[PDB]
Amino acid sequence: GVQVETISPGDGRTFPKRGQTCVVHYTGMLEDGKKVDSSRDRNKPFKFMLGKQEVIRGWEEGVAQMSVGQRAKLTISPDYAYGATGHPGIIPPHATLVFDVELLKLE
């Protein structure tokens, strides 16, 4: 599943609802700490809409548990991410992924 470790607290009351656009900055890494991708390296935050199947399962479930302003480490098992196949050149097979995620705002 997805495990959540809080790094910095959010407001503790404003949580994302399906249909809302989540604006976040993230760093995705393999279990051994190696960086695969990061929005912080790109000039603009990442955005997705909750409930539209726009992202891997672990993210839908994990980010829905965060409040605005919160920063957390989400540890996602393969079955909740890219599973057996992974994704060529980016994610190896059966990979557990760890994301450092910061929920900036909802829109």
Query: Where does this chain bind ligand AP1 (CB under 6 A)?
Result: 26, 28, 36-37, 46, 48, 53-57, 59, 82, 87, 90-91
Q: Does the protein bind a copy of itself through residue 79 (CB under 8 A)?
A: yes
Q: Which among 54, 94, 95 has a CA at the least distance from the CA of 63?
A: 54
Q: Does the protein bind a copy of itself through residue 86 (CB under 8 A)?
A: no
Taking the complex as a whole, how short is the minimal distance between the CB of residue 95 and ligand AP1, in angstroms? 10
Q: Which residue, chain included where needed, has tokens 């920063």? A: 71
Q: Judged by CB under 8 A, how many residues of this single chain contact a copy of itself?
A: 5
Beta-carbon neighbour count of residue 24 at 10 Å?
Answer: 20
Q: How far apart are CA 94 and CA 107, in angstroms?
A: 34
Taking the complex as a whole, how short is the minimal distance between the CB of residue 85 and a copy of itself, in angstroms? 11
Amino acid, res. 91: I
